[PDB]
RNA sequence: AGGAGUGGAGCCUGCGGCUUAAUUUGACCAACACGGGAAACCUCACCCGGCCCGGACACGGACAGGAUUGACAGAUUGAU
RNA sequence: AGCGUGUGCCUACCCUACGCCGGCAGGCGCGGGUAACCCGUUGAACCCCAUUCGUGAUGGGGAUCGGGGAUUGCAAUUAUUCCCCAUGAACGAGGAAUUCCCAGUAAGUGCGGGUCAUAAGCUUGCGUUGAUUAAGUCCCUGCCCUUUGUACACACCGCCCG
C-alpha cells in the first residue's frame, strides 16, 4: 500500500465511510453496504476453517518490522472475500502449480483472491497448422 | 408408462430410438355386505398373478 | 491413519450411482430406474416390459 | 489391525448362527446396518470373509452388487474349535426339508 | 420528486456513497473510471478489457473475427 | 409398516425382484439344469417355485442347499422372518426348455469336447422331444485366432411378426 | 497412465522408537509403591494408566482429542 | 412441378488447427446438439501437490521389559 | 386445448391451491394430493377486438457492456441461474452451391417428458392454426431383373501404356 485518495481523503471513501470505520465495524454493519454476493458468503458461512488464514495474516503483520511488509502466507484457497483487516499482508495463491504473490490493497475489498492470480497463459499464435 | 431411449449403446451409426410401453389396468367392484364373508371369499379362487386390495370403507 | 477420507457428496452426478457395478456416465433416475440403459435393453424380455410397440 | 479383536468375533459368531452371510460392496458404510449391529464402520465383513475364503472353508457368489457367502463343513469344524463351542452344535439349521 | 431508488441507473456507485442518476457526457466519464479501476487493482476484468476480449463468460473460439 | 408406494412404482419394484433372482439363481444352479422360476405371493406367504430339471442336486442330502437359499433371501431383500417359503418343481419335456438346453451344451463344451458332434447331439434331442425345428449358433474362435460362425439348423423357424 | 517419475524425498511411516519398557513404577522399599506423575482422571479412563510427564504439556495418550493440561 | 430454408448477418453448440504446465478421449453417405457428453466440486479418464493400503494366503524372521496402534501441543504444512 | 407428470423415491428429496408482504426476482403463514379423488372444469400461445407508432438502421433488431437486487449450494471468480435500470452493434433478404417435404401433410405457434441441488437455443412426444403444387418420369443421383462384352476377382477407388 502506497496509494492515496482511494478510500479516504478527497476522492473516494468506501461507499460513504472511510477504512477506519470499517475496522471497528462488525461484519454485520459491513455486509449491509451494497455488494449482494458478499452477503451470502457471510450469513450462510460463518467460518469453515478460514481460521487458518486469518490468524496467520494478523500474526505475520504484527511481527514484521515497521515500514516493511511480511513474508507470505500461502493458500490453495482462491475464495475468500478481501476485507479491510487483511490489507497490508502479502499472500501467495496457488494456480495449478504456481503461487503468484500479490500485495493486498484497500481498493481490492469486496473482490476474491482468485481474480488477482491467473491460471493460464494469455495466448499467442500461431501460424495455422496442416489440417 | 413410456420409455423413449437409445437403441444404440455407444452412439454411432444412424440415430435410432425405441419406444417401450407398459399398460396397467385398474377397475374396482363396490360391495356393501358384512366384512366377514367378503374377506373370507375374496382371497380364495384366484389363479393368476393379479393383485387385490380390500378397503374398510369409502362411502 | 487419516482424519479424512471423504468430502460432501449430497447432490450431483457423483452422489447417485447406477447398478452396473456403481457405474455412472449415463445419468439415470426415471420412475425409479437406478438401472443402466445398456442392461435395461437386455431386460426387455425380463419383467417390467414386453415390447408391443 | 486391519481391524479390532472384538469385531472379528461379532462376524464369526453371527455367521455360525445363520449359516450364511450377505453384504454389499461399499467403503462409505458408516456403521454397517443390516445386522452386525453398529460396530463395523468399514469393510470388515468383506475383508474377513475373503481371508477365510483363501483358506477354503466358505464359498462366495456375487450378483448385482451383493456378496453371498455360503459356510461349508470344513469351516464349521474350524469355527467350532476356534470359538470353543460344544462338539455337536449347529444352530444355523438342522432338519430334513420336505 | 419521488422516483424510487431501484429505478435509477446507479445505486451506491461504489466509493461515492449514494444513489445517482447519470446523463450524457458524465456517463462516459464515469464509465472510463470503472475500466481504469479494474486495471488499477488489475483483476481478471481489466486484463480482458485491455486485451480486447469478452469480459463475461462466453466462448471466443468461434466468436469474433475482424481476421480469417 | 406403512404406508405404501404408488401403483406405478408397485410394478417396477416387483419386476426388479423378478429379474435379480432370475440371474442370482443362474450363477449357482447352472450345473443342476436350471430352467427358470415362477414367483407367487400368496396369503401371508411367499412362494418361489425354483424350476430345474433335476431336483436331486438342488435338494442335497438333508435339504442343505434349499435351506441355504431360503436364509439368503430372508436377509437380502429384508423379508419379514419366516414368511419366505421355497418350493421346487421338475419340468417334464426338457427339449422345449431352450435355457437349459443351451446351458447343458455349455458344460459339454467346457468339459472338453468337439463342437460339431456336440451341436449335433443336442440338436436331435430337442428335435426328438418335440419341436417344429431348432437352431444353434456358435460364434467365436476355433482353429486359429480369427473368429468364424457355425450354424446347425433343422426343421422350421420363424423370424418375423408377433 | 504412464509410469511414476523420480521423487527426492519419500519416507512412509516412522518406526515409533524402540524405548525401554516399564520403569514408570519406582521401588525403593516394599510394600510401598512410589508412583511418579498422576494417573489419568476421566471416567472413561480406567485410571490404571499413567499420564504423560511431558512438562510444559500434560497429556493423556488414551485420550486422543481431549484432556490436555499444560502447566 | 412447387412450398419452406440452409450457405449471407448476430448468437448457441460440436469438430479441426493453434496456444498451454494440462488444455483428457472415441468417432471422419454409414463422424461432426453424436458417446443421454447442457463438465462449478463431484463427475474425471487429464495436469500439479499431499495422505492412505483396502499387498489375500503360504513359508521364514521378529516376539509378551512384547510384535504392534493412535495422538495433544510446538515446529512444519493449502491443511485442525 | 392436448400427451403427461407429481412428496411417502437414493440416503433427503415433489407438485402446488389459498392468506399475507414486495415493482420484480422472491419471502412468509397455512392446507390438499399414493393421484378420473389434490394441483387442474389444466381459465397456454399463435389467432381475435380497440388505441399508439409511420417507411425513418425508426419505437425494426437486441448483440456488446456498466451498476444494483434475489435464488440454489460446502463453495458461484473465467460473470451457475433469475430479476431491475442504463448502454443500442451487425443486420434493410442474402454468391458459388445445397437440404427436406404429397394431407390434418408442409409452414407458423405453444406445452409435457428426458438430463436436473441450481439451468434448454438440444432431443423425444403432444395439441392448436393450417396452404401452394403433383396424380408424373428415368434427365440427373441411385436401386431391382434379364441380355451382352471384359486383359477385372484386393472386383473400375478396378486394371494398364510410353
From Swiss-Prot, chain A:
Protein function: Component of the small ribosomal subunit. The ribosome is a large ribonucleoprotein complex responsible for the synthesis of proteins in the cell.
Localization: Cytoplasm
Keywords for this protein: Acetylation, Cytoplasm, Isopeptide bond, Ribonucleoprotein, Ribosomal protein, Ubl conjugation
Ribosomal protein in keyword set: yes
Entry keyword Cytoplasm: yes
Gene source species: Oryctolagus cuniculus (Rabbit)
An example molecular function term from Gene Ontology annotations: structural constituent of ribosome
Disulfide bonds listed in the record: none
Pfam families in UniProt: Ribosomal_S19 (PF00203)
InterPro entries (alphabetical): Ribosomal_uS19, Ribosomal_uS19_CS, Ribosomal_uS19_euk/arc, Ribosomal_uS19_SF
Crosslink site: Glycyl lysine isopeptide (Lys-Gly) (interchain with G-Cter in SUMO2): 105
Gene of this entry: RPS15
One of the GO BP terms on file: ribosomal small subunit export from nucleus
Name of the protein this chain belongs to: Small ribosomal subunit protein uS19
Domain of life: Eukaryota
Family: Belongs to the universal ribosomal protein uS19 family.
UniProt xrefs under HAMAP family: Ribosomal_uS19
Listed PANTHER family: RIBOSOMAL PROTEIN S19P FAMILY MEMBER (PTHR11880), SMALL RIBOSOMAL SUBUNIT PROTEIN US19 (PTHR11880:SF2)
Chief subcellular location: cytoplasm
Assembly notes: Component of the small ribosomal subunit.
Any GO CC annotation of this UniProt entry: cytosolic ribosome
UniProtKB/Swiss-Prot annotation, chain C:
GO molecular function, one term: zinc ion binding
UniProt keyword Protein biosynthesis present: no
Sequence positions that bind Zn(2+): 18, 21, 36, 39
The protein's required cofactors: Zn(2+)
UniProtKB keywords: Acetylation, Cytoplasm, Endoplasmic reticulum, Metal-binding, Methylation, Phosphoprotein, Ribonucleoprotein, Ribosomal protein, Zinc
Gene Ontology CC, one term: cytosolic ribosome
Cofactor note: Binds 1 zinc ion per subunit.
Residues with Phosphoserine modification: 6
Primary localisation category: cytoplasm
Cellular location(s): Cytoplasm, Cytosol; Cytoplasm; Rough endoplasmic reticulum
Modification N6-acetyllysine, positions: 45
Pfam family for this entry, one: Ribosomal_S14
Record PTM Omega-N-methylarginine, positions in chain: 9
Single GO BP term: cytoplasmic translation
Primary role: Component of the small ribosomal subunit. The ribosome is a large ribonucleoprotein complex responsible for the synthesis of proteins in the cell.
Family (UniProt): Belongs to the universal ribosomal protein uS14 family.
Alphabetical list of NCBIfam families matching this protein: PRK05766.1 (NF004424)
Subunit structure: Component of the 40S small ribosomal subunit.
Name recorded for this polypeptide: Small ribosomal subunit protein uS14
UniProt gene name: RPS29
Curated annotation (Swiss-Prot), chain E:
Domain of life of the source: Eukaryota
Keywords: Acetylation, Cytoplasm, Isopeptide bond, Ribonucleoprotein, Ribosomal protein, RNA-binding, rRNA-binding, Ubl conjugation
Modified residues (N6-acetyllysine): 18, 30
Molecular function, one GO term: rRNA binding
GO cellular component, one term: cytosolic ribosome
Keyword Ubl conjugation applies: yes
One BP annotation, GO: translation
Covalent link Glycyl lysine isopeptide (Lys-Gly) (interchain with G-Cter in SUMO2), residues: 15, 18, 30
Compartmental location: Cytoplasm
Family membership noted in the UniProt record: Belongs to the universal ribosomal protein uS13 family.
Task performed by this protein: Component of the small ribosomal subunit. The ribosome is a large ribonucleoprotein complex responsible for the synthesis of proteins in the cell.
Subunit note: Component of the small ribosomal subunit.
Name of protein: Small ribosomal subunit protein uS13
Origin species: Oryctolagus cuniculus (Rabbit)
Record lineage: Eukaryota, Metazoa, Chordata, Craniata, Vertebrata
Part of the full-length chain shown: 77 to 144 of 152
UniProtKB/Swiss-Prot annotation, chain G:
ZnF C4-type: positions: 40-63
Modification N6-acetyllysine, positions: 23, 32, 71
Species this protein is from: Oryctolagus cuniculus
Cross-link (Glycyl lysine isopeptide (Lys-Gly) (interchain with G-Cter in ubiquitin)): 26, 32
Subunit composition and interactions: Part of the 40S ribosomal subunit. Part of the small subunit (SSU) processome, composed of more than 70 proteins and the RNA chaperone small nucleolar RNA (snoRNA) U3.
Function: Component of the 40S subunit of the ribosome. Part of the small subunit (SSU) processome, first precursor of the small eukaryotic ribosomal subunit. During the assembly of the SSU processome in the nucleolus, many ribosome biogenesis factors, an RNA chaperone and ribosomal proteins associate with the nascent pre-rRNA and work in concert to generate RNA folding, modifications, rearrangements and cleavage as well as targeted degradation of pre-ribosomal RNA by the RNA exosome.
Entry comment on modification after translation: Monoubiquitinated at Lys-26 and Lys-32 by RNF25 in response to ribosome collisions (ribosome stalling): ubiquitination promotes subsequent activation of RNF14, leading to EEF1A1 ubiquitination and degradation and rescue of stalled ribosomes. Deubiquitination at Lys-32 by USP16 is required for maturation of the 40S ribosomal complex.
Region of interest (Disordered), ranges: 1-14
Compartment(s) of residence: Cytoplasm; Nucleus, Nucleolus
Protein name, entry field: Small ribosomal subunit protein eS31
Amino acid at each position: 500500500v502506497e496509494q492515496k485518495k482511494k478510500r479516504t481523503f478527497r476522492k473516494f471513501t468506501y461507499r460513504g465511510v472511510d477504512l477506519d470505520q470499517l475496522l471497528d465495524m462488525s461484519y454485520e454493519q459491513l455486509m449491509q453496504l451494497y455488494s449482494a454476493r458478499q452477503r451470502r458468503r457471510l450469513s450462510r458461512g460463518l467460518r469453515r476453517k478460514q481460521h487458518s488464514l486469518l490468524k496467520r495474516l494478523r500474526k505475520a503483520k504484527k511481527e514484521a518490522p515497521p515500514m516493511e511488509k511480511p513474508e507470505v502466507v500461502k493458500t490453495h484457497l482462491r475464495d475468500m472475500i478481501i476485507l479491510p483487516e487483511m490489507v497490508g499482508s502479502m499472500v501467495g495463491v496457488y494456480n495449478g502449480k504456481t503461487f503468484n504473490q500479490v500485495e493486498i490493497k484497500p481498493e481490492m475489498i469486496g473482490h476474491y483472491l482468485g481474480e488477482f492470480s491467473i491460471t493460464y497463459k494469455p495466448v499467442k499464435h500461431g501460424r495455422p497448422g496442416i489440417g | 408408462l413410456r420409455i423413449t431411449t437409445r437403441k444404440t449403446p455407444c452412439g454411432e451409426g444412424s440415430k435410432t430410438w425405441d419406444r417401450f410401453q407398459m399398460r396397467i389396468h385398474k377397475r374396482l367392484i363396490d360391495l356393501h355386505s358384512p366384512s366377514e364373508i367378503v374377506k373370507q371369499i375374496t382371497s380364495i379362487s384366484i389363479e393368476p398373478g393379479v393383485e387385490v386390495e380390500v378397503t374398510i370403507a369409502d362411502a | 491413519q487419516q482424519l479424512y477420507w471423504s468430502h460432501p457428496r449430497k447432490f450431483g452426478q457423483g452422489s447417485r450411482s447406477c447398478r452396473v457395478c456403481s457405474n455412472r456416465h449415463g445419468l439415470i433416475r426415471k420412475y425409479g430406474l437406478n438401472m443402466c440403459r445398456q442392461c435395461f435393453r437386455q431386460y426387455a424380455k425380463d419383467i417390467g416390459f414386453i415390447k408391443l410397440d | 489391525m486391519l481391524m479390532p479383536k472384538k469385531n472379528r468375533i461379532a462376524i464369526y459368531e453371527l455367521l455360525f448362527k445363520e449359516g450364511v452371510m450377505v453384504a454389499k460392496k461399499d467403503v462409505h458404510m458408516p456403521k454397517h446396518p443390516e445386522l452386525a449391529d453398529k460396530n463395523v464402520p468399514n469393510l470388515h465383513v468383506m475383508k474377513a470373509m475373503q481371508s477365510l475364503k483363501s483358506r477354503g472353508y466358505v464359498k462366495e457368489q456375487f450378483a448385482w452388487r451383493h456378496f453371498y457367502w455360503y459356510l461349508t463343513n470344513e469351516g464349521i469344524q474350524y469355527l467350532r474349535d476356534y470359538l470353543h463351542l460344544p462338539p455337536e452344535i449347529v444352530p444355523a439349521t438342522l432338519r430334513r426339508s420336505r | 420528486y419521488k422516483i424510487p431508488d431501484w429505478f435509477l441507473n446507479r445505486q451506491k456507485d461504489v466509493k461515492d456513497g449514494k444513489y445517482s442518476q447519470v446523463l450524457a457526457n458524465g456517463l462516459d466519464n464515469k464509465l472510463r473510471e470503472d475500466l481504469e479501476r479494474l486495471k488499477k487493482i488489475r483483476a481478471h476484468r481489466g486484463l480482458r478489457h485491455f486485451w480486447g476480449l469478452r469480459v463475461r463468460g462466453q466462448h471466443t473460439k468461434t466468436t469474433g473475427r475482424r481476421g480469417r | 409398516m406403512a404406508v405404501q408406494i404408488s401403483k406405478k412404482r408397485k410394478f417396477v419394484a416387483d419386476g426388479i425382484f423378478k429379474a435379480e433372482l432370475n440371474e442370482f439363481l443362474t450363477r449357482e444352479l447352472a450345473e443342476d439344469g436350471y430352467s427358470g422360476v415362477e414367483v407367487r405371493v400368496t396369503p401371508t406367504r411367499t412362494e418361489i417355485i425354483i424350476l430345474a430339471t433335476r431336483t436331486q442336486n438342488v435338494l442335497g442330502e438333508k435339504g442343505r442347499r434349499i435351506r441355504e437359499l431360503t436364509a439368503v433371501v430372508q436377509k437380502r431383500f429384508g423379508f419379514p422372518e419366516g414368511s419366505v417359503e421355497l418350493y421346487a418343481e421338475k419340468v417334464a419335456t426338457r427339449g422345449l426348455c431352450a435355457i437349459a438346453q443351451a446351458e447343458s451344451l455349455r458344460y459339454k463344451l467346457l468339459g472338453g469336447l468337439a463342437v460339431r458332434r456336440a451341436c449335433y447331439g443336442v440338436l436331435r434331442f430337442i428335435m426328438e422331444s418335440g419341436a417344429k425345428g431348432c437352431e444353434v449358433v456358435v460364434s467365436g474362435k476355433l482353429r486359429g485366432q480369427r473368429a468364424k460362425s457355425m450354424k446347425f439348423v433343422d426343421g422350421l423357424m420363424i423370424h418375423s411378426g408377433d | 497412465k504412464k509410469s511414476y517419475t523420480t521423487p527426492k524425498k519419500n519416507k512412509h511411516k516412522r518406526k515409533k522408537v524402540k524405548l525401554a519398557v516399564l520403569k514408570y513404577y519406582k521401588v525403593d522399599e516394599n510394600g510401598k509403591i512410589s508412583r511418579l506423575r498422576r494417573e489419568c482422571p476421566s471416567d472413561e479412563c480406567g485410571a490404571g494408566v499413567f499420564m504423560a510427564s511431558h512438562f510444559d504439556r500434560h497429556y493423556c495418550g488414551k485420550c486422543c482429542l481431549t484432556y490436555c493440561f499444560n502447566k
